[PDB]
């Protein structure tokens, strides 16, 4: 963006830059604020702080190294809270998709000084670098061992029958000979005058209160609703017991957690380089599904050559990266989906390909070469686009012209 | 691989919840010990309806019919016609569609044919005035159930059109921690192939029970005669207690059999309505499963609903357990601070569900 800050470094002394502008850079980072990004605020993700294999070496020797391993990854959670229950589907970049076998929280290994002061303050009432690589009813429902009938009797048939159970007609009649006990629910319809005034005030509130029940701009009105809902979430959680809280919301961001995955490829454990990051990202239900993705795709401006139909092209959708064979199409004045031979030189075109589905409005980029050997000197970003639709079928069609004399 | 369930219990719910979650499920041991084991005809027809309104879904029914493998696809909807077997009324098949209708690639336009009422399933007026309003509370602005022809049992012959124009990303977050003040009582007393006198006697019957009350009581008399009146004589009533304040409705309904007294049924339904309002806090028992499910599939926020200690029965518990099995969500209940009543607030965190099928 125009006016963006740009820092200048002159030379290196003792493997260190001059202190003066390092202070400038450090202060800038300290006071910086971060915009809310759509993808980050809808998925849980975690950068692996440390990697550890829990596989029993006895298994490694008897079956051999080829055996699939169980691995534990520790790190700080980001984005939306991760559900506490095991079985959650996540994708590790460059490895594949796995299921959370176990998950548990650990004490923060690098507590911030403000946090430690509060804990020390808590103790009264009763390290700066971390680089490892370098009969309550509610319970009764959720104890499946107790049958629902057994549950009910302790603290005091099926949904195919829509009509709820009712007592017999005669006993119901005797129960409701009088309308008492429910009068509160229904609207009512020298000193007593004030008493009359109060009831009519309550009725007026009940009759028309909402129509009456301001922020200057429509934007602030939208923000207020979001803030109000967030405030309600906090209040419910603050009333809420820590263990049961974790059971509802899961593990919130900032929690240092241990995640254990089974059936990981052994090559990941053996071929582990600490320089290359390990990125774990949660998957929504749509991300699991596979099918036809309809997207608006265009050749990147700085890419030398146009793309071709049924040409391998590596996509970057969401957390996942994969190679497919897309088909570029045209709407033909919004009549039929006609296959193109190549992408337009300087315009978008509809592109169809098979792969993991994703929500509409999920942007992506395209690359033809990822290996260093074939990098060359040209720009490697080949295509850019936005996913428009997800479907299991599509009807691309080509022009076939029969010739006679 | 598959989440496994036992028996025919909550067949429609388990299938519908599988659709919304996208998680494959297995239902086994369906009426294994019965003389006629396996699925009933209407259950199979219900699966056919699910197949019609979805795409990419795979369903297996066992050779013995006692086991089902279900792999959900995407909700696509469209225009279709469904023939409902006489074993069940139309409301049996309409009810699950209400769950799935707002979240489709295309609008639901389904024409149902068959019996339009029964003793055990939601009636036409129950849907129109009793459940659909709850959806309207959740953000389903446009939804309509048109009664083209009424069909009473046993020969039926009724036709109804379900149209849900509103397509929304996910239900709005509920915040209802108070007991709605119900302002008036309305209802519909309908009859087919019979004299108008029965309807009037029926409305007369309900009026006696409700006359002691302090609110208006006006029941519509919808007498059906002629070609559109179906093939069988029948008559039934639905009474609805309405709270204009926050658009909540409590309703009770039932239909009459041959030889029964119209006045007695009107009295019974009126009493049953007085029962439901006594047992209810924010929603009725017959509306609660819809309310709970939609909250689970809301945005990742805490929705609050006030429920009475009467609603926590066997049906409520199994509903929560099935939800946890499929969605892993736990409903938390807390006492209200009031001492006048013993209601509780059900706080549910949404899963962040979003309607990805719709084109943008």
């Amino acid at each position: 963006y125009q006016g963006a800050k740009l820092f200048y470094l002159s030379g290196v002394i003792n493997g260190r830059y001059p202190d003066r502008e390092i202070l400038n850079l450090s202060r800038f980072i300290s006071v910086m604020k971060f915009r809310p990004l759509k993808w980050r605020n809808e998925h849980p993700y975690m950068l692996a702080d440390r990697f550890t294999d829990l596989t029993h070496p006895e298994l490694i020797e008897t079956q051999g190294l080829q055996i699939d391993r169980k691995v534990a990854i520790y790190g700080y959670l980001h984005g939306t809270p991760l559900p506490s229950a095991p079985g959650t589907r996540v994708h590790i970049a460059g490895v594949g998709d796995f299921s959370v076998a176990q998950i548990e929280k650990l004490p923060d290994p690098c507590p911030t000084p403000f946090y430690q002061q509060k804990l020390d303050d808590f103790e009264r009432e009763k390290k700066l670098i971390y680089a490892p690589m370098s009969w309550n009813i509610g319970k009764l429902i959720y104890m499946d061992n107790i049958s629902p009938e057994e549950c009910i009797r302790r603290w005091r048939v099926d949904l195919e029958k829509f009509v709820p159970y009712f007592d017999t007609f005669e006993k119901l009649a005797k129960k409701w000979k009088s309308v008492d006990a429910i009068k509160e629910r229904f609207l009512g319809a020298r000193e007593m005058n004030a008493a009359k005034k109060e009831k009519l005030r309550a009725q007026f509130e009940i009759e028309e209160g909402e129509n009456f029940k301001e922020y200057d701009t429509w934007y602030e009105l939208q923000k207020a609703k979001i803030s109000k809902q967030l405030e309600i979430n906090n209040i419910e959680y603050q009333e809420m017991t820590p263990e049961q809280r974790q059971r509802i919301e899961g593990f919130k961001a900032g929690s240092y957690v241990r995640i254990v995955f089974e059936k990981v490829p052994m090559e990941f454990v053996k071929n582990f380089n600490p320089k290359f990051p390990i990125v774990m990202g949660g998957l929504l239900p749509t991300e699991i599904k596979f099918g036809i993705v309809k997207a608006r795709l265009r050749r990147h401006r700085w890419h030398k050559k146009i793309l071709k139909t049924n040409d391998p092209l590596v996509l970057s959708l969401g957390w996942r990266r994969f190679q497919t064979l897309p088909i570029y199409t045209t709407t033909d004045s919004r009549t039929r989906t006609r296959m193109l031979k190549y992408t337009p030189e300087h315009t978008y075109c509809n592109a169809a390909f098979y792969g993991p589905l994703c929500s509409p409005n999920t942007p992506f980029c395209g690359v033809q070469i990822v290996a260093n050997s074939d990098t060359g000197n040209g720009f490697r970003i080949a295509a850019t686009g936005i996913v428009e639709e997800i479907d299991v079928n599509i009807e691309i069609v080509k022009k076939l012209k029969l010739v006679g004399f | 691989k598959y989440t496994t369930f036992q028996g025919s219990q909550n067949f429609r719910l388990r299938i519908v919840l599988a659709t919304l979650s996208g998680k494959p499920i297995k239902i086994e041991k369906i009426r294994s010990g019965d003389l006629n084991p396996g699925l009933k005809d209407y259950e199979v027809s219900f699966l056919r309806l699910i197949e019609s309104v979805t795409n990419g879904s795979v369903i297996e029914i066992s050779y013995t019919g006692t086991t089902v493998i279900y792999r959900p696809g995407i909700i696509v909807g469209g225009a279709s016609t469904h023939i409902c077997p006489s074993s069940k009324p139309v409301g049996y098949f309409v009810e699950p569609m209400l769950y799935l209708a707002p979240f489709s690639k295309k609008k639901f336009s389904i024409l149902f044919k068959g019996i339009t009422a029964s003793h055990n399933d939601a009636g036409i007026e129950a849907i129109k005035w009793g459940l659909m309003p709850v959806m309207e509370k959740f953000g389903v602005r446009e939804c309509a159930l048109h009664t083209l022809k009424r069909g009473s049992p046993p020969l039926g012959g009724g036709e109804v059109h379900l149209v849900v124009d509103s397509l929304i990303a996910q239900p709005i977050t509920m915040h209802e921690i108070d007991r709605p003040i119900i302002s008036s009582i309305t209802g519909v007393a309908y009859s087919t192939r019979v004299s108008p006198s029965l309807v009037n006697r029926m409305i007369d019957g309900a009026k006696k029970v409700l006359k002691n009350l302090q609110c208006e009581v006006n029941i519509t008399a919808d007498v059906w005669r002629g070609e559109n009146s179906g093939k069988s004589p029948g008559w039934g009533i639905t009474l609805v207690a309405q709270s204009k304040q926050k658009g909540w409705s409590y309703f009770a309904e039932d239909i009459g059999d041959a030889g029964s007294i119209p006045e007695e049924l009107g009295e019974k339904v009126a009493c049953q309505l007085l029962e439901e309002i006594s047992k209810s806090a924010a929603v009725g028992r017959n509306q609660l499963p819809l309310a709970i499910v939609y909250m689970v599939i809301g945005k990742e926020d805490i929705g609050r609903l006030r429920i009475n200690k009467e609603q926590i029965d066997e049906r409520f518990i199994i509903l929560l357990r099935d939800i946890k099995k499929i969605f892993n969500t736990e409903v938390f209940l807390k006492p209200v601070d009031e001492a006048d009543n013993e209601d509780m607030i059900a706080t549910i965190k949404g899963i962040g569900f979003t309607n990805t099928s719709k084109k943008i």
Binding site: N393, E395 | G38, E51, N55, V58, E60, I61, Y63, G73
Partner: peptide, 14 residues
């Protein structure tokens, strides 16, 4: 026309 845009289907082995 029912079969044009379908990929699933009911497999009834009863």
């Amino acid at each position: 026309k029912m079969m044009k845009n379908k990929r699933g289907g009911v497999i009834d082995k009863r």
